[PDB]
Amino acid sequence: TQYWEEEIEIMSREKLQELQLQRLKKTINIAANSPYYKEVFSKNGITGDSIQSLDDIRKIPFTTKSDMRANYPFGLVAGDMKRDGVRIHSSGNPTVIVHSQHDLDSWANLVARCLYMVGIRKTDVFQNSSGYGMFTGGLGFQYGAERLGCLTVPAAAGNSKRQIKFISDFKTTALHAIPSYAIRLAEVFQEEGIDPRETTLKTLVIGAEPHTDEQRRKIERMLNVKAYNSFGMTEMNGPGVAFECQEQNGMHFWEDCYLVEIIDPETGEPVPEGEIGELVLTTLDREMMPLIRYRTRDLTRILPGKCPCGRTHLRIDRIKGRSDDMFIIKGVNIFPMQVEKILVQFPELGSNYLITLETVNNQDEMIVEVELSDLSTDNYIELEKIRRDIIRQLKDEILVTPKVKLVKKGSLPQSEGKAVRVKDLR
Amino acid sequence: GMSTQYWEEEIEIMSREKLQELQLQRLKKTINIAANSPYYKEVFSKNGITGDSIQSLDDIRKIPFTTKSDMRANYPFGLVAGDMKRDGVRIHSSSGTTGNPTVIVHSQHDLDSWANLVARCLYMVGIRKTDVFQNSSGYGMFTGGLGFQYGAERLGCLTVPAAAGNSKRQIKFISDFKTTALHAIPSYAIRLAEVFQEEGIDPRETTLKTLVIGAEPHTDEQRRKIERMLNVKAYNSFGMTEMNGPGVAFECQEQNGMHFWEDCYLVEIIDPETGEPVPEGEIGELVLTTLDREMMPLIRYRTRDLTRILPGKCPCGRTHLRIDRIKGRSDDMFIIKGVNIFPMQVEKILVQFPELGSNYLITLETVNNQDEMIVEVELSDLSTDNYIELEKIRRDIIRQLKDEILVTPKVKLVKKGSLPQSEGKAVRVKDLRDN
Ligand SMILES: Nc1ncnc2c1ncn2[C@@H]1O[C@H](COP(=O)(O)O)[C@@H](O)[C@H]1O
Ligand SMILES: Nc1ncnc2c1ncn2[C@@H]1O[C@H](COP(=O)(O)O)[C@@H](O)[C@H]1O
Ligand code: NA
Ligand code: NA
Ligand SMILES: [Zn+2]
Ligand SMILES: [Zn+2]
Prior knowledge:
The structure is a homodimer.
Chain A: H1 6-9, H2 13-31, H3 35-43, H4 65-70, H5 81-84, E1 85-90, E2 96-100, H6 101-117, E3 125-128, H7 136-148, E4 151-153, H8 160-170, E5 174-176, H9 179-191, E6 203-207, H10 213-223, E7 226-233, E8 238-244, E9 251-253, E10 258-263, E11 277-283, E12 294-300, E13 302-303, E14 315-316, E15 321-322, E16 327-329, E17 332-334, H11 336-343, E18 349-360, E19 363-372, H12 380-398, E20 403-407, E21 422-424
Helix pairs in contact in A: 6-7, 8-9, 9-10, 11-12
The complex binds adenosine monophosphate (2 copies), sodium ion (2 copies) and zinc ion (2 copies).
Enzyme class (chain A): ligase
Subunit structure (chain A): Monomer.
InterPro entries (chain A): Adenylate-forming_Reductase, AMP-bd_C_sf, AMP-dep_Lig_C, AMP-dep_synth/lig_dom, ANL_N_sf, PA_CoA_ligase
């Protein structure tokens, strides 16, 4: 195994904790200068002596998206923005993250660290099909990949024909795409008469949206690549927060730059070790605008045990779904991943699907539209048998009986960005 | 002069004598680097260019011109002189899939040199690290995006990477982030002042102080109109992807000619017909040579831009030559919404549809201060009048053009023989804008 920063990546749990505590104290002292935490810390009796251990963080209230919207745009800016601010990023009212040069360098180093871990080197041709501008994925991977030294191709979002031309003519080896756009690319290669398994592509970086392991394995087969799960959010910089190692089993969270908590969304207490809860994060290397115990609304768990790659930084499971992604139908709580985890195991089905929620008279109804695979199987009796097995397997998982419609390949809508899997018309 | 502040004083006010010895030292190094590229290795052997060929700056005229046609013929890496696998860190590409685009490969040195020139430009017109700099240019493969982004960060501005379009969000950023310096194409700068009034905001009473305008030819009266509408100082910015993008030439606070950074570029003005140097101060074609690029240097590149060198010393005290505003081109290229387009790009899309004829006309107009591109194309009679099917094809034309020329044009399907004709040498472009 090769590391970008070996001394940090394989640091003992004991030394890593002392580093987190040193940086947690510094973060709280910096945050105290912002109008928001000056008031929060004052009202909750948070002083320079309040944090003596990492468990003392639980003395501080959570920071919510609502708290951030209420303090838009610069209520949480702790540093001297006029003197040291170098960038404003965005994601009703948008969320603003203000960065200093230190913050951008720390972020670029984390992205380089992530890319290096999955085997990308300066000899790689890295193409970024993420949107640029206010999108953190754009400039975040651009700076990270340049810090590593890749020959970068700043393709940006859309124009699939141009994307394929760049891969073919510039001999791209590493590609950053949202999982649903990675599938569209394989299809565009075939449309342009190129075998998607015989290109120069070797590594794919996929994140931005929840997706199953089988969806990633489908992408790996279509393009004959190794695809890696990438976790990020604007509040936490963007990309580079958590990332799979070459074991493809859990995403390593960089604990030298983040303090990770998994809380019970109801009680607000830490969940038992290894249980699903809401991911709550604290920045440990941000200076202009630190975030303390930020409630991400993302649900996941901490995967136990040390990893065979030798890294000592904890691993998180793939995101189950966001809290706002959940929908209630006939009194039952359902997540769109529960539907995807069932649909992906059928090889007769495609990758695009849509959940539609409607009211028929006074009763709510759930419709699951899923595209059929290009791989023949055009037999009504056999397809209808599979469709019945889909309703059956859904009913057992989501504990409600949905309507399932098998639709033509490419008939469902395709977004320019993250896929919208639920359309609620109630 | 006395009150003037410089980013790099030793370079910006360097004596003409010292500046010419610096140019000669870098010109020799550039030719030795370029000799490693497949393209210049072949040009230098065919024209007897050796390590002893350049002894003075006038000896550059021993080397033939590099044209866009030569670059397209050597697509994608025929002019790469450095070790791209070991040191290449970025590729910038021009638009299209119909023909061979233009590719510029940069090393870390090249990106640092580029960002220092943009920082130098921004500092000259009074922008400081305390400024809130908003970039309304397109990012991705657009050099205006990453070029101003890196330059403004190098200077230290609080940057707002707004990128292209969404005027209501542009005005929101200016209002909420208290933007003081804005980069926009001149026609978009006018649109933003109109959108401010539509949203009930006085465009003269915002936090804006400095505007950086470029990418498209515009008159001085157009710039002064922008200054009045937004109560700002607006400065002309010259650049092109081949020379990096932004940071090539830029107005000083005198707003009288654009200073060309001669420590990084060797500037020649030639007769577009003969290829000979024009008499000092006359209009000719701008021919440029990179002096600080290492991965892919460009020698005597024919820009096709027509301008002149403005004589006399500048009161700002800078010794780097000034060029007049670009009033035209010696080729068929046109610029709309800050995007460079060739009429052949359009033609290579239109010929793919059998439902269309051979006659077409591109018209450039200004409708309610906004620039618009109209593509009129005659209908082939090897197609019937199925409105629903024709309109479907017309939408596919707009879609395929947008993907190629990177701008959304208006497409009008006209009757066979309805378009005018006067020759085979007929100008497929009719520009009716006040420029
Ligand atoms: N690897 C990933 N898997 C699942 N969801 C993700 C992943 N990366 C990002 N997200 C989601 O995207 C959100 C961040 O969105 P944004 O700030 O717009 O980039 C996160 O809070 C997650 O809900
Ligand atoms: N300040 C300017 N005034 C007029 N035309 C400009 C200006 N800056 C750039 N251009 C035009 O834009 C071309 C370069 O486009 P690009 O390579 O996309 O940056 C030049 O060769 C000019 O024709
Ligand atoms: Na490289
Ligand atoms: Na600043
Ligand atoms: Zn691991
Ligand atoms: Zn001057």
